[PDB]
Design a protein around this motif. Structure first.
Motif, mmCIF file in Angstrom:
data_model
loop_
_atom_site.group_PDB
_atom_site.id
_atom_site.type_symbol
_atom_site.label_atom_id
_atom_site.label_comp_id
_atom_site.label_asym_id
_atom_site.label_seq_id
_atom_site.Cartn_x
_atom_site.Cartn_y
_atom_site.Cartn_z
ATOM 1 N N UNK A 61 47.435 56.849 6.812
ATOM 2 C CA UNK A 61 48.400 57.774 6.235
ATOM 3 C C UNK A 61 49.841 57.385 6.516
ATOM 4 N N UNK A 62 50.075 56.893 7.721
ATOM 5 C CA UNK A 62 51.390 56.448 8.113
ATOM 6 C C UNK A 62 51.780 55.336 7.142
ATOM 7 N N UNK A 63 50.923 54.325 7.035
ATOM 8 C CA UNK A 63 51.194 53.197 6.154
ATOM 9 C C UNK A 63 51.545 53.654 4.742
ATOM 10 N N UNK A 64 50.776 54.590 4.206
ATOM 11 C CA UNK A 64 51.059 55.063 2.862
ATOM 12 C C UNK A 64 52.421 55.776 2.831
ATOM 13 N N UNK A 65 52.702 56.569 3.862
ATOM 14 C CA UNK A 65 53.958 57.295 3.928
ATOM 15 C C UNK A 65 55.167 56.367 3.923
ATOM 16 N N UNK A 102 55.407 53.496 2.975
ATOM 17 C CA UNK A 102 55.458 52.840 1.689
ATOM 18 C C UNK A 102 56.094 53.747 0.632
ATOM 19 N N UNK A 103 55.706 55.014 0.597
ATOM 20 C CA UNK A 103 56.281 55.931 -0.384
ATOM 21 C C UNK A 103 57.776 56.128 -0.129
ATOM 22 N N UNK A 104 58.153 56.047 1.144
ATOM 23 C CA UNK A 104 59.528 56.211 1.573
ATOM 24 C C UNK A 104 60.377 55.056 1.042
ATOM 25 N N UNK A 107 59.674 53.137 -1.434
ATOM 26 C CA UNK A 107 59.711 53.204 -2.876
ATOM 27 C C UNK A 107 60.736 54.222 -3.348
ATOM 28 N N UNK A 108 60.819 55.342 -2.639
ATOM 29 C CA UNK A 108 61.746 56.402 -3.016
ATOM 30 C C UNK A 108 63.183 55.872 -2.923
ATOM 31 N N UNK A 109 63.497 55.247 -1.804
ATOM 32 C CA UNK A 109 64.813 54.702 -1.601
ATOM 33 C C UNK A 109 65.126 53.657 -2.662
ATOM 34 N N UNK A 119 50.029 62.874 10.590
ATOM 35 C CA UNK A 119 49.613 61.490 10.492
ATOM 36 C C UNK A 119 50.664 60.659 9.788
ATOM 37 N N UNK A 120 51.198 61.180 8.686
ATOM 38 C CA UNK A 120 52.234 60.465 7.961
ATOM 39 C C UNK A 120 53.415 60.145 8.885
ATOM 40 N N UNK A 180 58.393 49.894 -7.413
ATOM 41 C CA UNK A 180 58.732 51.111 -6.682
ATOM 42 C C UNK A 180 58.103 52.300 -7.395
ATOM 43 N N UNK A 238 54.172 52.604 -7.070
ATOM 44 C CA UNK A 238 53.707 53.189 -5.827
ATOM 45 C C UNK A 238 53.273 54.649 -6.041
ATOM 46 N N UNK A 239 53.815 55.276 -7.081
ATOM 47 C CA UNK A 239 53.518 56.665 -7.410
ATOM 48 C C UNK A 239 52.670 56.768 -8.666
ATOM 49 N N UNK A 269 61.764 62.484 -5.293
ATOM 50 C CA UNK A 269 63.159 62.078 -5.327
ATOM 51 C C UNK A 269 64.126 63.020 -4.635
ATOM 52 N N UNK A 290 62.169 63.085 -0.248
ATOM 53 C CA UNK A 290 61.919 61.877 0.520
ATOM 54 C C UNK A 290 63.070 60.885 0.436
#
Lengths: 58, 145, 145
Positions: free
Chosen positions: A20-24, A26-28, A30-32, B36-37, C87, C90-91, C108, C111
């Motif tokens: 979950x950390x890894x996915x998080x 990663x999403x972070x 991507x967001x930036x 966890x995240x 990017x 990923x979603x 957006x 996060x």
């Protein structure tokens, strides 16, 4: 409630977390990445707006 | 001590991601996901304990202040890399430091807080482990840290 | 290595658009908007670093010479439509090149270096949302580059 069980549980919580950390993270990232391009293109649109009205500035 | 301004910012970020409408809460059901995240590894038992010590009401939600408390609390009790390694060696017949990828999958889905096939598959994928190979769990633990 | 006469002229022109008085300065709050008008796509953190480097006041100003100096170093050229597309991917749950307009909005604005609702509304507004509330994000990739 026993050694094999505990050992296994300690491993399972570490894996569940890591996934979950890894996915998080990663999403972070991507967001930036999306956020800088959004800010980048809206700014370019705005500058275009300014360029357009400067010519009209007397 | 207590959470820094920086840690508070980090947790609000993630918490707000799961706070579907910005109302200040996340469902008790997804408390584990958020923790966890953010990098904490709680057991399904601990999750249920934390929930209980906050959801007497039965509303099934958690607010930011309590979430920050749970996080600070859980953070105090964190396993080391060796403690995780040790867990691996009970399944490591001969102290070589490895474990069949096949054995690992069997334990993960049959003992303790049984992982899903999907979760075990994901694990093998994200860890680039040979489905029919040997996992150098000493490194695998390092990778997950 | 340094900025050529052409670059200097291009940069002065861009910088000047945001210089209300012709006094040779742009507010610190607009430093990003100006680099962006020159094709860059800096993160909020990178900007804050640049600002701190020259000890500027957040409610203060920056001058042409330091602006030029910033652009000479801080100006990069690693972007590409590939990274912005990955990017978004990923979603992309189904992998068919679409994403939920509402999920994009929520991610957006919570996060990372979150955008304001207005900024996201501006972004979504220029794309076509279909029946299942989804968007072909290659539309954003195209207009963002």
């Amino acid at each position: 409630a026993d050694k094999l069980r505990a050992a296994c549980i300690r491993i399972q919580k570490t894996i569940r977390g890591w996934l979950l950390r890894k996915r998080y993270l990663c999403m972070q990232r991507a967001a930036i990445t999306v956020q800088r391009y959004v800010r980048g293109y809206q700014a370019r649109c705005y500058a275009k707006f300014l360029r357009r009205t400067k010519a009209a500035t007397t | 001590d207590q959470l820094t301004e920086e840690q508070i910012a980090e947790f609000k970020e993630a918490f707000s991601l799961f706070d579907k409408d910005g109302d200040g809460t996340i469902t008790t059901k997804e408390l584990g996901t958020v923790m966890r995240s953010l990098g904490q590894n709680p057991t399904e038992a601990e999750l249920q304990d934390m929930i209980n010590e906050v959801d007497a009401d039965g509303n099934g939600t958690i607010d930011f202040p309590e979430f920050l408390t749970m996080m600070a609390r859980k953070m105090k009790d964190t396993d080391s890399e060796e403690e995780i390694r040790e867990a691996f060696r009970v399944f490591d017949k001969d102290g070589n430091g490895y474990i069949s990828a096949a054995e690992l999958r069997h334990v993960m889905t049959n003992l303790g807080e049984k992982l899903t096939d999907e979760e075990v598959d994901e694990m093998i994928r994200e860890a680039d482990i040979d489905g029919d190979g040997q996992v150098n769990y000493e490194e695998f633990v390092q990778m997950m840290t």
